[PDB]
């Protein structure tokens, strides 16, 4: 049980403070109880609460109080920091014709020199919707391959990427090829990951019921981010207490990037609309991928985010097969883990393979990285109650029998004098009992009310009388023995 404090300079004049602990657990059908629950003001002994200062006052429950605390599973929430967006699978297209016919060195050359208004691949622009030549993206026009001798050794070595037949002397036969970088419809958003925060929910049910010798219910929710809640017009407050910091050994994903599918540039591709659908089977296919598998600058080949500079500047580009520089993309990680998921094995990139990923309440374009855990831990919950309506005051003053005045005259009439000593204006109720034993009919006790400093006399109708003074609540103050007859 808790004590009662005066409300120092949380709205109250007097305040009941109680501290409880609640712990979470995996209950089952058989053992279904993890709750912390306590009742107050129901038994005849726990009906009063000691005061912090001035013990002469105790507070009795006006209602019987039911408080129940339950704790959710413990979740690790990883803060996300937006990096940029990344294409799912870039692909190379090869052009060997244009609107004039086959590409060749004589009458219809492949054009990819920077600055030309005539690139066979076209340019890309930044912003993408622009056609201003000043907004052309460097290296976006791709590059040409032809039936010449490159700087390195060989005879017509640049024919390989475009599949050119450098032996036919024929104007229907193209002798040059253009190579352009393109991005498929699906774009992922990538996030950096911070160190996790702990999260849980504590439900506090406070139920007031009448005394017995209708019920009311208020629910307070508590969390590490919102640790203080109120109820019944600020008359009640609950607060979770402790170091909510993550523990040692919690998994860290700092070196990784959170890859969330976000955008379809061509919404007419049903496969793309599926990849961004916020349903649990696809959200569990979002990916954590090591940062060193990504190129944020796009000038590194065979890395997530590869772009025009890496594609065009690859050494001996024309001697390489198509789609070179474009390996190991998000689509390849997806297919790799998808086949593992489709065969009951454990992959390396899907979030479902990292733990109990929370898919609830996720809104598109506002993703989160949250994992439920094994953890069970106790959390102290401090409760405060405005005592104005929960308790009425009960005062306890000292009280003596005035021995120099309380006598017995020789008919049974006991003249008793009681004094309450001290200062105060709050009366206290006292019970006076008499136990005259030898052949004396019973004497009924009587309640007397005395404020500090007051003094009253009451008469009670070979013997001896045991007279006892009792407090308003389960105490005895003074006892005097007096002879009779
Ligand atoms: C906040 O906290 C307070 C108290 O801490 C809660 O109030 C308490 O709610 C309890 C249930 O909600 C309630 O206990 C009930 O007592 C009733 C009898 O007085 C029961 O009818 C009631 O439901 C039963 O529970 C049984 C458990 O299995 C169940 O078997 C039973 O169903 C069988 O029995 C009926 C016949 O009664 C058949 O018709 C039926 O077909 C089944 O055979 C039934 O479900 C439960 O036992 C407490 O009395 C409440 N205490 C107080 C002080 O009010 C609040 O609910 C909490 N608030 C919130 C929001 O959580
Ligand atoms: C929880 O921990 C226990 C041992 O402490 C382990 O056996 C169990 O597999 C764990 N479960 C989960 C879901 O982490």
Numbering used by the authors: 37 to 45, 52 to 255, 274 to 470, 477 to 527, 537 to 560
What did the article's authors report about this structure?
The Cyani HAP2 ectodomain (aa 28–564) was expressed in Drosophila S2 cells. A crystal structure of Cyani HAP2 to 2.3 Å resolution was solved by molecular replacement with the Chlamy postfusion HAP2 structure, and was refined to Rwork and Rfree values of 22.3 and 26.2%, respectively. It is much more extended than Chlamy HAP2, in which D3 folds back over D2 and D1 in the trimeric, postfusion state. Multi-angle light scattering (MALS) showed that Cyani HAP2 was monomeric in solution. The fusion loops of Cyani HAP2 locate to the membrane distal end of D2. Although the interim β-sheet locates to the boundary of D1 with D3, it shares two backbone hydrogen bonds and an extensive hydrophobic interface with other residues in D1 and is therefore part of D1. Switching of the J0 β-strand from the interim β-sheet to the D1 β-sandwich in the postfusion state dictates a large change in orientation and position of D3 of HAP2, as the J0 β-strand leads directly into D3.
The protein HAP2/GCS1 (here called HAP2) is a gamete fusogen that is found in a wide range of eukaryotes including protists, algae, plants, insects, and hemichordates, and may be the “Eve” that enabled sex to evolve in early eukaryotes. Although their sequences are highly divergent, HAP2 and viral class II fusogens have a common overall fold and domain arrangement. Here, we study the gamete fusogen HAP2 from Cyanidioschyzon merolae (Cyani), an extremophile red algae that grows at acidic pH at 45 °C. HAP2 has a trimeric postfusion structure with similarity to viral class II fusion proteins, but its prefusion structure has been elusive.
